[PDB]
Every structure is written in C-alpha cells, then in structure tokens.
C-alpha cells in the first residue's frame, strides 16, 4: 500500500543517484534490440543486473538493513522500480506478435560484503530463516530441467476476446498467497467454450541443485552436511556436479510442518529451502601485463627446466618425473580420423617403486595445481562408481543416470593411488575408458554412450615389498600386460642407500619441517579454522604457482602446433634405433612408441609457445623416453 509505494520511490531515487545501473540497462536493451534487426545473422541477454550492497549501505542505511534482514518486504518493491526504469528507457516500440503477453520482468542480483550472513550448510540454523544469506559448498546432485506454467491464455468463441489466468507457487514468489490448482479454465463467465492457446502463455525453466559442505572444513568425527537450492529462469544449467560454488539467496521455510490434520508426532518438522538470487564460481582471466610477461618468459632458452622444477618445490629430486607431469599438464593435439575414430591426445603415466619414495605426494600436488582433477583409491572404489550409476529423480519421477569419477573428469586428470590393490572386476572398466575413452551404459532401459577424455596418473607397488633386480620385470609387477600397454611412461623408482644422498635429503627434510606461517608465533598451534570468517568481500629462479596456472591455461587454449618433416626424421631414426637393440628394457617396445614420441614432441612444442614441431622437441621426447625405458640417464 503506502509502504510499497514509498519503498518504490526510495529505490527509484537510488537508481538515478548512481548512473552505472542505468547505463547497463541501456546497453542490454540496445544489444537485444539491434540483435533482432540482423536478419542475416551470424544469443539473448537475460534481464538481470548485479548491484553492490556496499553502495546501498552509504546511500540508505534503512533500506540496506531491510534488504539484509527482511528481504521479503524490500526486494519485490525494488524489482517493480527496476522494471519501471527499464520500461521508461525503451523508447523504440516492439509490436511483436506475442511478446506483448509476456513482459519478462527485470530482476536483481547482489554483491559486496555480507558481514555475518556468510555461512556454510552447517552453520545455517532456524535463526537465519527469512534472511538473505550466502552459502559456499560443492555441488553433488542436480535435477532435470522442467518447464513450469505461470500464466495461461484462453480464446473465447462467439465473442472474439481473450482471457488470462495467473498462477503462483510457494517457490515462485517471496510472499505467501492463496494457492492455485493449475487447472485450465474451460467455461467462460457467460458459459462460452474456452480454448487454450499455447504460444501466448508463459513458462519458466525450473531446476533444483544440492550443495554440500567442503569436507576439509568438517569437524572431527562428523560427516559433511548438505542443503537444497532452487534455480529458475536464467540461472538454469550454470552448475554441474563436483563444482565449487557460492550461492546467494533467501533462506525460506515451506509446507505445513506437521501442524495439521495429520497425527501429532515429534519426528515431523518444517522444510527449508533457498531461493537463489546469484551463483558465483569460486578460468582465470588474463590481462595484457600477464600475457606480455608470458610471452617474455617464453623466449628464455631454459624455460622447460624452470617450469618442470617449479613443480612441488618440497620434493627433493625426481626431475624426470616432474618433467613428465608438466608434459601431462600441456596435453597433445587430438586428431579426429575417418571411420569415426580419434587419436588420443592424453599422456598417461604409471609409477612403480619402493615404499616411502614420494609417489603419493606428487598425486596430491597434481590434484591441487591442475584445473580439473579427481582422486581415486584402489580398494575404496567400484566399477559402478567410476563409470555411471542408475538413480531416480525425486522431484519429477523419471529414472536417470548419475556421473562417476571417470566421466566427471572430462578434459581433466584422474589420480589413482594403490592401483595394484584394485579388484579384477573393478580393473576391467578402467581398461575400456583407457582404450575408447567412452563409457557404454545398457542398463534399465538407458542405452547411452558417455564421453570421458581424461589423463591417468597412477602409483603402485611391486608384488613384493621392494623391487628386485634379480627377477624379470613382469614378475615384479602384478598388473596384466593389456593394462600395462596403455600407459605412455612407466617409471620404476628405487631407493638406494648412499651417504651423500642421505646427508642431502635429510638436510632438505629437516629444513622443510622448520617452516613458520606468517602471522604465527613460535609454539602457536596452527588455527586452521578461519574463525567462521569465510570471506571478506563476496564477488636460479622459480615461478609462483598461479603464474604457472596462467601459463598452462594460455598454452592449452592458444597454441596448436603441427608436425614437420625434419622432426619426423629424428623420430623415425630414434624409433628404429630403439627397436633393434639387445638392451633389456623394463617394458617391451612396440609400434605404439612412435605415437608416444609424437605426443611428447607436440607437448614440448606447446611448452615453447610455437605453432610448429622442431627438432629440439624430438630430442627432448627421445631423451625422456630413453630415461623411462632404459634408465641410461
């Protein structure tokens, strides 16, 4: 009534006080308008802006406090004012055939500092209901996208006029209203037959996601907790399972909560939900300074050595394995070939070695430094847990598929630990993914082929406790030959007792164990708790890790080298020399070694930020594979 109009006036004043929002409205409007005029087209921007809570805090403390504390009485007044401003801006007429019926009202999004309203799915209780909150977590489950009716239009014969009926739901609006039965009117007020006219009605896409707490922040002895978020309109399909997200929305109650005709019970409570306003991913955009630095650092001669050594500075030695990991990070170029085939561009590495040889501390580093990485353990995994699982969608009722570890890491890496301890029934599935890079599901009436293009790095142990040099290589490794053929580089690492090596490595380890984080006193235990302050503002030389991430991203997305003849000449001579020799290698040499040389050469070419494969790339690939197969170093 009066309060609604007063708040509309307040927000209207706020809008012309700061001119940025008015300019963004015009930019979106002109973009959408002149896009439709391009008949010879080469797509549509949604009606949603992002305002900062901070600026509103200086403008009007009362309105900011109302939005943060009582959103359900201050957001709808703001949306009407934004719609009015947007309607005022659009001077050009749009006599469209059916856009007159559906207005697509403008909505709002928020950013800035939330103070005490930044929480997690665990610290959210009944004290935060009907409040604007932001929750950080990991997406686990998503529902199928369905259309929902918002307004129905009917045509009346013998009169020629139209009649519309509006529908509302608890999840649709922020205010509780009288419910609607969602049944189309059939009789006019005068009794004339009504015909439903699809194409003038309004439907909106609806989705439900589940956000779980980060497992690293959970208390001792407790399992992580999860919450449900509802997305609508233009927020649909902006998240996938496994993603790390931050969702800003209104925490809301729903239902009757067992205080009704049903029997009295202590086990019945209310249901809680979040109507998300905004979603933020917790792709690093690069400026011209960063790109210029990358191009300047590319021209240095010893760039490969620096890049490889920058990996895991807390590991002493293992230079060649660290080079192989870097070559994994910058994968090869995939070739699509006739007969529906593709040559894989991924590099797969296996490490077999003695106990306590820093095999498992490199997989953990790859988990952190890479863009996408999935961790797996041999004994705690199953075949149905790696490829896909048949489940049900509670909200709609169909039967669907849920992704597994391999398919969730498409265009990523999978790090498997204790690979030899995996059961045989489990080990067949990974075989297919390593060969075809596709999963075939033919269960419960769901016949589908799923794409899985991932790089595999694995660590295992020999049959006995330690590697034996007096026995043949195949006796030492329990893995079958078919599985072993699918790895590009097999590294056998051994711990040998030598006084100088021990003196150096012990010094390095003792130096590492004496590190104090900044801002901590001696003897002060590390407080890895953050004190519930999740965030302050809601949205020889070595190189730093973020710079390496930028370098890897830029190389993967900007250069695609092509093979040359003079590199092929080196590759063929290396292959012919390696094949025809009496040296006893730890792995047999076959016709698939040539493809490994090609892939390593392509990766080294990408490292140099060049569009051609040179002779030096072939030499580096040859040296790496000679070290891997022979140990001639």
């Amino acid at each position: 009534d009066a309060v609604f109009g007063d708040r509309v006036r307040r927000f209207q004043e706020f809008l012309d006080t700061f001119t940025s929002y008015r300019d963004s409205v015009r930019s979106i409007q002109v973009y959408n308008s002149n896009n439709a005029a391009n008949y010879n087209d080469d797509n549509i921007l949604p009606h949603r802006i992002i305002i900062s809570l901070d600026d509103l805090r200086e403008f009007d403390r009362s309105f900011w406090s109302g939005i943060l504390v009582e959103p359900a009485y201050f957001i709808p007044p703001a949306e009407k004012a934004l719609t009015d401003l947007a309607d005022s801006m659009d001077d050009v007429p749009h006599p469209n055939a059916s856009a007159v019926s559906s207005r697509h009202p403008w909505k709002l999004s928020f950013k800035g500092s939330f103070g005490a309203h930044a929480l997690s799915p665990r610290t959210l209780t009944a004290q935060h209901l009907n409040k604007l909150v932001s929750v950080e977590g990991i997406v686990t489950k998503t529902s199928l996208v369905r259309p929902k009716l918002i307004r129905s239009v009917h045509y009346a014969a013998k009169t020629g006029r139209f009649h519309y009926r509006d529908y509302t739901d608890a999840t649709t609006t922020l205010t509780t209203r009288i419910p609607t039965p969602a049944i189309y009117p059939t009789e006019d007020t005068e009794g004339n037959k009504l015909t439903t006219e699809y194409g003038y009605s309004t439907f909106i896409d609806h989705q439900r996601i589940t956000v779980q707490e980060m497992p690293e922040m959970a208390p001792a002895g407790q399992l992580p907790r999860s919450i449900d978020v509802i997305l609508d309109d233009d927020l649909v399909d902006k998240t996938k399972p496994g993603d790390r997200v931050n969702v800003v929305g209104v925490f809301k109650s729903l239902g009757a909560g067992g205080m009704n005709q049903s029997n009295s019970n202590t086990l019945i409570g209310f249901k809680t939900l979040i109507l998300g306003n905004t979603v933020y991913p917790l792709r690093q955009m690069l400026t011209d300074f960063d790109i210029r630095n990358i191009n300047k650092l590319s021209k240095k001669k010893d760039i490969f050595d620096i890049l490889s050594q920058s990996l895991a500075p807390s590991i002493y030695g293992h230079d060649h394995i660290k080079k192989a990991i870097l070559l994994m990070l910058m994968g090869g170029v995939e070739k699509n070939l006739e007969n529906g085939s593709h040559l894989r561009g991924d590099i797969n590495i296996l490490m077999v070695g003695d106990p306590s040889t820093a095999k498992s501390q490199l997989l953990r580093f790859v988990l952190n430094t890479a863009s996408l990485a999935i961790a797996t353990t041999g004994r705690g995994s199953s075949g149905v847990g790696l490829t896909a699982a048949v489940t049900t969608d509670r909200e709609t009722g169909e039967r669907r598929l849920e992704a597994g570890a391999m398919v969730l890491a498409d265009r990523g890496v999978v790090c498997i630990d204790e690979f030899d301890k995996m059961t045989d029934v489990d080990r067949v599935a990974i075989h297919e993914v390593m060969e075809q890079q596709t999963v075939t599901i033919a269960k419960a009436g769901i016949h589908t082929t799923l794409n899985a293009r991932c790089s595999v790095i694995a660590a295992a142990n020999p049959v006995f406790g330690q590697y034996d040099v007096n026995r043949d290589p195949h006796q030492n490794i329990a893995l079958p030959d078919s599985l072993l053929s699918r790895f590009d580089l097999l590294f056998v690492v051994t711990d040998d007792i030598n006084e100088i090596r021990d003196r150096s490595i012990s010094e390095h380890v003792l130096r590492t164990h004496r590190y104090l984080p900044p801002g901590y006193l001696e003897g002060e235990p590390v407080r890895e708790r953050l004190n519930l302050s999740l965030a302050v503002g809601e949205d020889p030389k070595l190189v730093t890790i973020p710079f390496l991430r930028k370098y890897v991203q830029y190389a993967k997305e900007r250069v695609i080298p092509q093979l040359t003849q003079e590199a092929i000449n080196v590759i063929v001579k290396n292959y012919t020399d390696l094949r025809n020799d009496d040296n006893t290698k730890k792995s047999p040499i076959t016709a698939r070694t040539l493809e490994t040389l090609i892939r390593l050469a392509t990766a080294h070419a990408k490292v140099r930020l060049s569009k051609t494969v040179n002779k030096v790339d072939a030499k580096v690939a040859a040296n790496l594979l000679r070290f891997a197969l022979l140990g001639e170093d």
Partner: protein, 436 residues
C-alpha cells in the same frame, strides 16, 4: 472472474486470407490453383495426406506485396501458434472440397454403408465433421534458400538440439536434430466414438480431445425421453473413427553435449500417414509443434505446476538391386582386372603389410556352398578364421575394418558385455513387464 486482455491478432481476417490463398495461389515456375488440383486428387480416394508449404504462403504474400495490398503475415502467425491453425485449415479444406469427378467405387466401406443408411431414415422420417474426414493435414517448415531470397529470416527450420529447447519455445513450430533410439508399435487412438442405443433414436457421436474420457451411457433422444428405466449405451467399434498413433524418443548427439554433462532426451508423437517414417538408429531432422503434456493422474500433486512435454511431428528429413547400372558395374570391375589382389589390398589401406591375411579375409567375406544332403546330412559353407599373434601388430583395427564391408555383422568383445551367448528367454522390458 477471468480478466480480459487485448491481443493484435484477429482470426476473421486470417480465415479470409486462408480462403483467398487456397483459391488464388498458382505455381509461377498442369495449370490453375496448386492446391485445388491436389484436393480433386484427394476426392478420388487416392491421396491420404495434405501437406502445406510455408514457402508457398510466402509466395502468396509476395504476390500481394506486388499488388501492394496489406497482409496479415500468415507465416509468422503459423510459427508463433500452430495448434489452432490446423483446425482453421481443416475447416477451410472442408468448405472448398471438390466433388468426386470419377470412379465413385462404393464397395464394402462400413462407414460408407452406415452414412448411406442414415440418409434414407433421416430424410424419410450435424454429426461431428471429423468423422467424415480422411485426409491428414501437415505443415512443412520454411526453407533458408527461399528465406534468404526474400530475407524475413527463419526460425521454424533451424536445427536445434534437445538441450537448446527452452520453455519459451512452447506452442511453436520448431525443428530438432538428433538420433532415434526407441520406436513403439502402432496402436489405434479414438477420435469420434459412436454409441448404439437399444433401437432408441439412433447412434450418438462424441469427440475426444484428450488422452482420457468417460462413456456417455445415457440415451437422450426424443424417443428415449420416456421415463422408464431402459438401459445404458453400448459402444460400436465399426461406426467409430480411429487413428494410427506412434511414440518415439530422440536423443542428443554426442558432438553437441558439453563436457561433464549427460545427454537429454525428447518425446515425439506422430499420428496419421506419417506413422512408420522413423526407425531406431536413424539420425534425422524432425519438425513439429512443441506442446505441454498434462502430467495428470498420480504423482501430479507433488509437481503442482510442473509439466511434461512432447513434439507433435509433421515432417521428416533423414540426413542419409538388379538394374542395368549394377549390371555394368560388375563388367567394368571385370575389365579392370587384378580383382583378387586389388580387392585384398584396398581392405584397410592404412595398414601396410599382412597381405595374405587380407586375401583370407576376402574368402571369409564370401561364403562356401551350403548343400543339404538327403537323410539329414548337412555341410557348412561358412568360414571360420582365427588370427593369433603378439600384441601390437594391428590386431584390432583389422577386425573392426572388416565389419564395415558387410552390413550383417556384429563386433562382440570380452566380458564387458554378454552378447555372444545371450540367447535368453527372459526380458524385463519396462514398457509392459512381460518376457520377450
């Protein structure tokens, strides 16, 4: 009650323009109207389907623009809403149906006998028109070539995917590209139901416009108005009109799925002569109307305002013998010479070597004599070829390649799936839960 809104579209002028377009339209390139020719063809019990082209409608609009008189952009009205224009066009066809010009040929048509028997008793001593109809009306999507010829852009024929189908496209005419995975059998769906009434008046007709209905079972004729309890209605199948119905599922192609996601699926309903146009395993481009399903019955309450959806199909565009031509192809290949070596060599030209293996695969491709000896003896002509050898010798390209040559072939692999010996007699098919 129900508020009222003003919309630009008026159906009276649209109906006038449809009537004008049916009569006036001529193919500019038989002479005369294009569609009154095929209507006369229909009237002779020969054509079972009527297909309208929106390119032709644009041609009529362009003719009117040449005259300069205003039009109602019928092509845009069809695209924005198409469930009502089907009935409008059906009425327009019914109004201007030509007379049977030749070969009336009434032989044993049960509906014809019923209708003819009605005339004598009705005249000596108003039914739903759809009962007398036989033709089926389908629309044809726009063409980019004609569009680019007259600009105006195009939306109905753009090859969208299952995933790009949002809720804003409901009630429009669109096209979807995908692969057909499942197709069901053809079953009859009722359109007009006729009830016979204990020699009370005569049979009554009701139309059905949903997937679910209720029987009448009460005779309301003037002679049946007498008060005595007399009995309910019984359905008569012969005087009722049925239709062929089929449902299929289309799935998104692997190329169009983004990384980390699972492909979606869409449902297609086809009625009429268009039935059986799609088979499993075909990559097609299907045009139709995208409509909301009612989702009623059980589990409707939990959804509340959530609906299913489906596509009423109207057009199909599949992307991809003894004759003198093949009689001459074999002669040409004979004159080519070196048939043995060339046939063996061209098999998988990527792989270099193993030429004797390629000779043997040719002999496996052809089959030996299968002679049925008397007294029960039989001799096999099929070929059993096993290829052993060390790993990494091109073992498993050679095989796959041979599968391409012969259409009747299956590539079966290890214990990942059980298909070699899966001659099972139990099949828990979800559709009906009976063994196959």
């Amino acid at each position: 009650a129900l508020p009222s809104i003003q919309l630009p579209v008026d159906y009276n002028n649209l109906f006038n323009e449809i009537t004008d377009f049916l009569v006036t339209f001529k193919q500019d390139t038989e002479k005369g109207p294009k569609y009154m020719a095929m209507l006369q063809k229909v009237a002779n019990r020969e054509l079972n389907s009527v297909i309208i082209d929106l390119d032709d409608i644009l041609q009529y609009q362009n003719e009117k623009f040449l005259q300069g008189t205003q039009a109602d952009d019928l092509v845009s009205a069809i695209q924005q809403n198409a469930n009502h224009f089907t009935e409008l066009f059906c009425r327009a066809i019914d109004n201007n149906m030509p007379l049977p010009t030749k070969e009336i040929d009434y032989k044993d048509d049960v509906l014809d006998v019923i209708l003819n028997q009605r005339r004598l008793r009705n005249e000596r001593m108003l039914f739903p028109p759809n009962l007398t109809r036989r033709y089926f009306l389908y629309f044809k999507p726009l063409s980019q070539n004609c569009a680019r010829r007259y600009r105006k852009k195009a939306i109905s024929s753009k090859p969208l995917s299952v995933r790009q189908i949002k809720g804003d496209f409901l009630g429009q005419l669109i096209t979807v590209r995908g692969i057909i995975t499942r197709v069901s059998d053809v079953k009859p769906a009722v359109e007009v139901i006729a009830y016979t009434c204990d020699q009370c008046g005569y049979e009554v007709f009701q139309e059905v416009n949903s997937r679910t209905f209720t029987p009448l079972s009460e005779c309301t004729s003037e002679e049946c108005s007498q008060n005595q309890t007399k009995g309910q209605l019984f359905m008569s199948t012969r005087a009722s009109k049925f239709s062929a119905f089929q449902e299929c599922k289309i799935q998104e192609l692997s190329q169009q799925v983004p990384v980390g996601h699972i492909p979606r699926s869409l449902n297609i309903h086809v009625n009429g002569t268009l039935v059986r146009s799609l088979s499993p395993g075909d990559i097609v481009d299907v045009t139709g109307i995208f409509l909301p399903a009612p989702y009623t019955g059980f589990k409707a309450l939990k959804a509340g305002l959530l609906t299913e959806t489906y596509l009423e199909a109207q057009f199909v565009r599949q992307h991809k013998s003894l004759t003198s031509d093949v009689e001459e192809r074999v002669m040409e290949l004979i004159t080519s010479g070196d048939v043995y070596n060339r046939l063996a060599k061209s098999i998988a030209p990527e792989i270099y070597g193993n030429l004797d293996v390629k000779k043997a695969l040719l002999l496996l491709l052809v089959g030996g004599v299968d002679k049925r000896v008397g007294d029960g003896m039989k001799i096999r002509g099929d070929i059993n070829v096993c290829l052993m050898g060390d790993p990494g010798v091109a073992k498993s390209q050679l095989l796959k390649a041979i599968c391409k040559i012969s259409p009747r072939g299956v590539y079966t692999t290890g214990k990942g799936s059980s298909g070699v010996g899966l001659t099972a007699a139990v099949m828990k098919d979800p559709v009906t839960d009976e063994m196959i």
